[PDB]
């Protein structure tokens, strides 16, 4: 398994491979394209992955999407691997979780104007830095904690602090938000990571591919801190339905694909069964 950084390392160590890589990069960014394709289908850049929380993930993804030829699903460039009161108490007794926790809270709970509720990009940056370098027995315990009443569900909803990040003035079109997320490098890669690990299945007994709860939970929590950042819909104790901040309105004749894209978050038996079995 060769990641794209070392694939560029072996690419820059050779003359023909670098020539065909820069040739295809000048093609994308007939006959010049097809020869570069039939050469670089044997490159170490061909089928290179990236890692979660690796150093210079952005360059790895910019290299990986550079060789990609120009669509509901895409290939993931990654390695295919009171209760909530007690979760917060287990965080605040460690030192690494406490510092970054107070970091994203003291950033995201700063009202600026009576119009601007909070700063968006710094709050997303703090949430990404929280959900990258914290051990996952702390994140999953605070974000997924089994509740029986309304106050526990409200604490669990308020954990990613949706008053700044999740909600907006309007609910835009889900397809437009998908286009915005697929414009950016990082959000498109996290969305493909979520699509590769959290589809429904008719063959496996838990409707999840490879019967892997862990990959679908990591593909869920890796979408926090982007524009396609989901959260719960209400403070329901047992009813657990996640959703991004959009809706099916404004769809036109593209209504069915919008509904099918939204049913990945609203009506996934794989993700809901994974959350329920993790709560058990």
């Amino acid at each position: 398994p060769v990641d794209c950084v070392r694939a560029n390392e072996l690419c820059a160590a050779e003359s023909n491979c670098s020539s065909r890589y820069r040739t295809l990069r000048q093609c994308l960014a007939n006959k010049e394209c097809q020869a570069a394709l039939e050469v670089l289908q044997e490159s170490p850049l061909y089928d290179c992955r990236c890692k979660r929380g690796m150093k210079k993930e952005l360059q790895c993804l910019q290299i990986y999407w550079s060789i990609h030829l120009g669509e509901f699903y895409e290939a993931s460039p990654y390695e295919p691997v009171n209760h909530c009161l007690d979760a917060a108490k287990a965080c605040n007794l460690n030192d690494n979780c406490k510092k970054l926790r107070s970091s994203y809270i003291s950033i995201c709970n700063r009202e600026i104007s009576p119009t601007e509720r909070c700063n968006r990009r710094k709050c997303h940056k703090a949430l990404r830095q929280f959900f990258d370098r914290v051990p996952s027995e702390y994140t999953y315990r605070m974000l997924f904690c089994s509740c029986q009443d309304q106050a526990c569900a409200e604490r669990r909803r308020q954990t990613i602090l949706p008053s700044c990040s999740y909600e907006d003035k309007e609910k835009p079109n889900c397809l437009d938000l998908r286009g915005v997320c697929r414009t950016d490098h990082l959000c498109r890669s996290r969305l493909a990571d979520f699509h590769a690990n959290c589809r429904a299945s008719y063959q496996t007994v838990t409707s999840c591919p490879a019967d892997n709860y862990q990959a679908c939970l990591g593909s869920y929590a890796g979408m926090i801190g982007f524009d396609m950042t989901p959260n719960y819909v209400d403070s329901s104790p047992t009813g657990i339905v996640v959703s991004p901040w959009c809706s099916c309105r404004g769809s036109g004749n593209m209504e069915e694909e919008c509904e099918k894209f939204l049913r990945d978050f609203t009506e996934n038996p794989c993700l809901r069964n994974a959350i329920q079995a993790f709560g058990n």
Binding site: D47, L69, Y73, E74, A75, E111, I112, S113, P114, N173, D176, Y202, R249, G250, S251, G252, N253, M254, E255, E256
Partner: protein, 572 residues
């Protein structure tokens, strides 16, 4: 010509013989000249747009639209094709079908392969003998000549198990299931503008099990609806009188359209609003903002959706006071049907006169920077984008005591004591000022009289007094000493509650209507000793919550402040 769906589904096994019929396709025409041809893509696609090999086992009948098996299968070909999946488990392949990969120009067909061979007729449940896993969902245009778009039977199932008695059945509906041929057709041409959805229950019957399966039908739209007024409204009268800001929604109207087809990507490129020219003042001071919104309307007890466009009219700059005009604006609307709108706009000027004499008083015990009175235009809370500044002109030019600064929120000026000694003199006891109300953009101005009486006595303060009111902590030391901002000469004490962290925190202020107001005005922000609990940028010791730009928004217990160190304390 258009494909009825975009995804057909089929299950495969090992060692199925050649000549086995796999499935049917359907491609409904649009004009009475169109014959559905069917050509196949020359690559067995794997997963995530990956070519495996050219198709060499599945052939097609263009007339009946019959996908069937050209050759047979084995373990060797499938274990060969599973290698080129590049680290992924072989679960589903798919082919591309052209007709003359996206709907309706192309259609991809799925194949879910099993490494085991074909199981027996009795070893399969009738639910897996009637319908596939993927329940269908169709795409149908409005107002087109109908035909046949679906067939029920599973062809390798009855090809390999013909002895199972299986029937299919549909339940003023245009759809129908034919006898002796299980194709589904539609009687008349349909429209979304009557009804958009048709969900049905199809019944399979075996020997013995009766299986009900949902059957959704979706109708698509064309641009068959010109823009329409809600009820006769073609004009909108509006007056630009007091706001005159860079941007304020002047006029607003709605336009109905049952056309949805120019969706949000191409919605700008089709629904066109055009301000008709004629005056450059309009083109420098006006514009038209436009956006739609989907609403749900009833047709025959159903709920379809349509577009309600909203046209609003927006200013472009700060209009000055000297505008005394009126216009009529004409708006073209293109729904690519041609609609016209009008707007009677009237921009009326503003009078800036004031009441002539502001008779008022001031106590002698007051200190520096203490609020007294308010100078304002007759319409205080009408100005939005017009800057109005206030000044003074002392008559004798020897008894300068007071000043006026202007808050741009209310665009109004507040009296403040500037000097103590001139108020302390018994000579300058009744003072006459010319309050001149000026302007910035256009130099129209006015003036007025200010009579003020220096009234009362003077008493010295205590020996250990600080300079601000908020230094005291108890109630008695607050009122027995005089700070800076109060016009009473003594500091005032407001007393809160024991309800935890509240806005009602007990404190010592200069004025109980000015200092813990929650707003840091122009008077308090001059020198930071007046009201530290509304205007500081510092640190707070105690359970609290700070203000939104600055200040103490809520505290606990008693709250005092040292403005010399920018520090505050809150404690019962």
């Amino acid at each position: 010509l258009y494909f009825s769906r975009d995804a057909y589904w089929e299950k495969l096994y090992v060692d199925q013989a050649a000549g086995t019929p796999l499935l049917y396709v359907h491609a409904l025409r649009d004009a009475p000249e169109e014959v559905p041809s069917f050509r196949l893509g020359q690559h067995l696609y794997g997963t995530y747009r990956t070519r495996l090999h050219e198709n060499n086992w599945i052939c097609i009948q263009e007339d009946t639209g019959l996908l069937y098996l050209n050759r047979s299968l084995d373990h060797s070909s499938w274990e060969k094709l599973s290698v080129r999946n590049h680290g992924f488990p072989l679960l589903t392949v798919y082919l591309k079908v052209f007709l003359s990969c996206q709907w309706p120009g192309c259609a991809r067909v799925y194949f879910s392969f099993f490494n085991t061979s074909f199981p027996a007729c009795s070893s399969l449940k009738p639910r897996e003998l009637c319908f596939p896993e993927t329940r269908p969902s169709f795409r149908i245009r409005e107002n087109r000549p109908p035909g046949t778009f679906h067939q029920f039977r599973l062809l390798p199932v009855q090809f390999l198990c013909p002895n199972i008695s299986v029937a299919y059945r549909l339940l003023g509906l245009p759809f129908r299931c034919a006898p002796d041929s299980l194709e589904v057709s539609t009687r008349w041409a349909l429209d979304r503008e009557q009804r958009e959805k048709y969900e049905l229950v199809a019944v399979c019957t075996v020997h013995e099990e009766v299986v009900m399966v949902p059957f959704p039908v979706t109708v698509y739209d064309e641009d068959d609806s010109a823009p329409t007024f809600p009820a006769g409204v073609d004009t909108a009268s509006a007056v630009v009188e007091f706001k005159r800001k860079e941007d304020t929604v002047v006029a607003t109207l709605r336009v109905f359209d049952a056309d949805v087809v120019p969706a949000s990507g191409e919605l700008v490129r089709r629904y066109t609003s055009t301000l008709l020219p004629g005056d450059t003042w309009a083109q420098q001071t006006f514009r038209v903002e436009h956006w739609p919104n989907e609403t749900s309307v009833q047709a025959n007890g159903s709920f379809v959706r349509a577009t309600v466009h909203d046209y609003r009219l927006v200013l472009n700059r700060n209009l000055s006071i000297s505008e005394n005009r009126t216009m009529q604006l004409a708006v073209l609307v293109n729904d690519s049907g041609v609609l016209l709108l009008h707007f009677n706009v009237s921009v009326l000027p503003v009078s800036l006169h004031l009441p002539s004499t502001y008779s008022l008083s001031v106590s002698r015990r007051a200190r520096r920077f203490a609020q007294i009175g308010k100078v304002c235009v007759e319409n205080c809370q009408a100005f939005s984008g017009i800057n109005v500044q206030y000044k003074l002109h002392s008559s004798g030019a020897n008894c300068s005591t007071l000043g006026v600064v202007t808050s741009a929120e209310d665009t109004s000026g507040i009296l403040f004591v500037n000097d103590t000694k001139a108020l302390r003199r018994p000579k300058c006891a009744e003072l006459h000022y010319m309050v001149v109300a000026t302007d910035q953009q256009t130099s129209r101005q006015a003036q007025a009289q200010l009579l003020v009486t220096v009234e009362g006595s003077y008493v010295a303060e205590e020996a250990g007094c600080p300079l601000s009111c908020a230094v005291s902590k108890r109630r008695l030391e607050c009122e027995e000493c005089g700070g800076l901002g109060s016009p009473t000469g003594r500091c005032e004490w407001r007393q809160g509650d024991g309800k935890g962290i509240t806005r009602n925190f007990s404190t010592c202020s200069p004025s109980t209507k000015t200092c813990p107001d929650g707003h840091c005005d122009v008077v308090e922000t001059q020198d930071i000793n007046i009201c530290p609990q509304d205007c500081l940028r510092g640190s707070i010791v105690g359970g609290h919550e700070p203000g939104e730009p600055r200040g103490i928004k809520a505290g606990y217990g008693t709250c005092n402040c040292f403005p010399e160190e920018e520090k505050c304390f809150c404690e019962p």
